Every structure is written in structure tokens, then in C-alpha cells.
Design a protein around this ligand. Sequence first.
Ligand SMILES: N[C@@H](Cn1oc(=O)[nH]c1=O)C(=O)O
Ligand SMILES: N[C@@H](Cn1oc(=O)[nH]c1=O)C(=O)O
Lengths: 179, 83, 161, 112, 55, 29
Amino acid sequence: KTSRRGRALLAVALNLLALLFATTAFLTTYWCQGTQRVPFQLRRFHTGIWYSCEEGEKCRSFIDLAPASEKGVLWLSVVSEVLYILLLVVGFSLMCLELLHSSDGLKLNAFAAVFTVLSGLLGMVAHMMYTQVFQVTVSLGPEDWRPHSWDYGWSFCLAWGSFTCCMAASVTTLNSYTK
Amino acid sequence: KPGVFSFLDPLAYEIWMCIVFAYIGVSVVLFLVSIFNSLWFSLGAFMQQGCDISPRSLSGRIVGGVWWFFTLIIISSYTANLA
Amino acid sequence: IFNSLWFSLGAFMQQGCDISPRSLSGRIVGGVWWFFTLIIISSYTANLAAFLTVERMVSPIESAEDLSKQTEIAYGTLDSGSTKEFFRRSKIAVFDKMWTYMRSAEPSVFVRTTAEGVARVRKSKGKYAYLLESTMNEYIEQRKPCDTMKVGGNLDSKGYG
Amino acid sequence: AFLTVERMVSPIESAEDLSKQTEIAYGTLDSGSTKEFFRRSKIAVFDKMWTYMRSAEPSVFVRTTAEGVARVRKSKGKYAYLLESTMNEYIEQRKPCDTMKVGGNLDSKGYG
Amino acid sequence: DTKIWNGMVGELVYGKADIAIAPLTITLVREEVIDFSKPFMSLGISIMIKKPQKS
Amino acid sequence: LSNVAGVFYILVGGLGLAMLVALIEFCYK
Ligand SMILES: N[C@@H](Cn1oc(=O)[nH]c1=O)C(=O)O
Ligand SMILES: N[C@@H](Cn1oc(=O)[nH]c1=O)C(=O)O
């Protein structure tokens, strides 16, 4: 019986890690390194997800930009993030109920699995939307800030976090079907 | 032309990361119908058209159809791009 | 008639059909279906490549009439000239409709110099179209950054003296 | 290959288009202001067109507008006719509705 | 209202200039107050737009 | 990758729909 418990708790901790990645990219400090070292003068952008920093050293807001329909894509993006987090927390909650019975089960665990799948389904869409938006932000001449550095930062690790979220989901739900 | 990159060129690396993650997501769904077993079955799904052995609809077989449509679209787009 | 629909979905899912005794009268359906889906996807591929070849675009607005039937793209003329007078005095339906819109648009759609009109076209992301004489138009069309174009025939025929 | 080659097609709808090719023949009416226009033009594109027309064989000039229209209609698109916009738009509204006026007018004048 | 002509047309009307050599369109209201030589260039009102790259 | 992302959307949506079908099928039983 120690085996199934180790599997379940391991999956719980893994999804907790995924939540840490969720917080990680939800708290991105610079989602893309950036530069415009114009031979003007040298420039180094550091675009946080809601916080376009420049680097003397400075960080700036710059959120909710062009254009309109894209802003709505940001709405769907953030809503998808919130529901993502909700499915996460419901997952951990169903895990805690499993702990309470460790202190349906199957019928409950699979539910969380499903939600976690849904969670994984949403953020992978969400980031697309975000990346979509980001490309669009680059596509429309980003005011002046159009770095050649263009490369992904913190959130990609969160994409892996959604990956291991689906992974731990599959592992614990397999632990459930093994019953 | 770097050995390898030229094949990679028609479709962007990000798109690859996306198709990979998406497939991984599709993969587990078959297991829901039932970490290794049905994931292996999904490995038996991407390899050939899409999914099998479903006792008429059930649940994930329609996922197999959507996945078939999916891989179909992507490979078509790829070939068109290289062309 | 449900399990059969399921199986049909399991036909589109993969090549096409299966659960018949050799042909019988069932496999033939899936064979024709296979040839069918094949020609479809092939055609899809060809057509998709076709956009990726020439990639010949042409927005949507191609004439004065086009301008008159929409409000998304603003348009105006030079001030104190024959072009503005043309629209102000036209009795022709399309031109009258354009003048009615221009004379009261806000912000103002009229410019003081041709240069100002060109700048407005270049910086308005396509949300501004300028009405000017064909001569200036074709000259500008040959100037950097080559981002403007003359579309449609001329509204009239006159000359400079 | 079909759709690709099809999309490559040129949008021959102007005088410049005509001047850069030799597959599609073109001419004007005889003894009129249109022929005189090309014969006297100093403008590059029109001069190039006149240079070609004045020596094309068989002759690309016609005696009547009617003859020009017939040549356009029966030449499978291998003949384009240069004529005044007025006659052009009139013909465009006559059966079998197989002709079309393309591009802007080369000049602006009038009948008196 | 004031019936006063501005621009190059005004320069001629009020005697500030003796001749106008520019892309001045021959029109009825102008020909009623000044003279025009025969056309030295032909033209027509047209529409110029920003190219197209909607992707 | 956008033009394909549109297909990703229908993919994921089909996934969720099929999951709902799995749910009601777990409801009959
Ligand atoms: N040539 C025109 C001046 N103007 O130039 C344009 O392109 N439009 C216009 O009104 C005139 O003599 O008034
Ligand atoms: N109107 C023209 C006769 N003609 O009609 C055409 O269409 N072209 C041409 O030369 C003339 O007075 O010479």
C-alpha cells in the first residue's frame, strides 16, 4: 500500500512544482531579452510579461497594447490563466481529499486528472495566444522597442510545467486505474 | 547549410514544440478512456493514421478522428511549405 | 444507426471503413471514400502551396465606389484646389456621397499640402486613403519607401495650363 | 503545378503590359486620331508600341471599329484593340458580352 | 462670402504676378477670371493607398 | 505558427468535448 501512496504523493508534489512554474511565468521578470544598440546609442530591452524593463537600469509597465481584438485575446489569455490556476487548485484539493481518506477515491481522482488535463489543455492554448499576441506586438512595429534579441525566457519552463502537470496527472490516475 | 537544420526550416521550432506538447496531451486522453500503457497505445496512434481498438465510439475514438484530421492538416501544410 | 455512425467516424479516422466481409457491399463504400478523401487532401495541399507561391494580395478597396461604401478607411483631399471643388460640386451619386462624408468628417480629412497627404497615407496603417491628381500619384508611387499605390481609373480627365 | 502556373499569369490590363510582350498582337483604326497618337508620341511606352505596330505582319490596323471588335472576339485573346473609351464602353454593353475595357485612358480629349 | 481668390490664382487676379507656371488645373471658375494656355500635361483625380501586406 | 494554432484550437476543443462525453458515459454507469 506504500507504493500507491508514494505514487500519489509524488504526483501531488510534481503538480505543486507545476504550480510553482505557473507562479514563475505569472511573475516573469523579462519574458524576452531585448536590444537596440543603434550606432543613436546602445540599448538593452528586458521585456517582462507585464513589465517592459530597459537597461540606466529601469523597468516600466507597458501592458495592454495594440490592437483591440488583440486586447481581447489577452482577455481570453488571462481568463484561461485564472481557470488554469483554478483547475490546479481543484486538483490539489481532490488530492487532499484523497489524503483525508488516506488518513469513491478513484472516481474522485480521475476527476482531478480530467481537470488537470483540462488545465494542461488551457495553458498550452493560453501561451499560444500570448505568443500569438507577442508576435503580433512585434508584427505591428512595437512603438520603438523591436529587439533583435527576440527569444523566449521564463514561460517556456512553465510550458514544461504544464507538461509535468499532465505527466503527474497521468501517473496518479494510472495509480488509480491500477486499483 | 548546417547538417540537419535545413529539414527543420520549413516549419518553425516553436511549432514543433507545440505539436509535441499537443500530441502528448492527446496521448493521455486515450488512457482516460481506459504513465505507460495507453500512452504506448497513443504511440501506436501517431504512428498510423490515428488510434484503434475502440469499441465503437466509446470516447477517445473521436479523439482519434480529430487527431487524424489534425496530423493530416499539418503534414499537408508542411509539404506545401517545402514546395 | 448509431454504431454505424461511430464506425464511419472510425472510417474518416483512418483510411476508410473496415467492418465488412471482403467488399460485400461495404468495403467498396470505404474504397471510394478513400479515393475521395485522397483527392481532397491532395487538392488541399496543392491549393495551399498555391498561396505560398505567388502570394498576390489586393486588400479589398479598389475604387472610388469602394471608398464610398465603407467608413473604416478615412479619405480626403487637398485644400484650396480643383480636387476638393470637384467633390463639392459633383452631382454624380458616388462622388456626392463621398463629399457628404468628407466635408464633415472628424478629425478633418483635408490636408494643406500634397506632402501632408502622402505622410497621412504612409502613417495611417491603411486607415487613410488620399484623393489627388494622377500626376502627383504616379510620381509618389516611384519614391521611397515605395509603400503607396495608385488604384482604379481616374475619376475625370483634364489638364494643367 | 496547374494552380501555380495559373497564378503566375500576367494581369494584362494596361498599355505597359502590351508593350512588354509579343504573344498578344494589338493595333488601331486606320486614318484616325488614335493611330496618329502612337505615330507622334515621344513617350517611351507609346513609342515602343508604335514601333511594333507600324511593322507587324500581318497588319494589326483595321478599317472600321467593327473590324477591330471582330478581330478581338475571334482571336482567342491573341489580339487586343486600341480604341476610344466611348466606343469601348459601348461595345462592352453589347452581346455576346465577351469584351472588356482595361486600364485607364491613355489621354483625355473630346469630340467636336 | 468675400469672393476673394487666394493661391496662385489670386496672385494673377490682383496683379502680384504676370504668369503662373505650375500644375494649375484648367477649370471653369478659374477660366472665368484668368486665361489658360492649351494643356501642357494631362491628368485626372485618382486614389493612392498604402500598399497591402495584411498577414 | 498562427495558421496552425487555429487548428490547435479545434484539436483541444475536440479533446474537451470528448472528455465531456467520457463524463456522461461515466454518468450512465
Ligand atoms: N492642380 C490642383 C491642385 N491639387 O493637386 C491635387 O492633387 N489636387 C488638387 O486640388 C489645382 O490646380 O487646384
Ligand atoms: N474619333 C477618331 C476615330 N477613331 O475612333 C477610334 O476609336 N480611334 C480612332 O482613331 C477620329 O476622329 O479620328
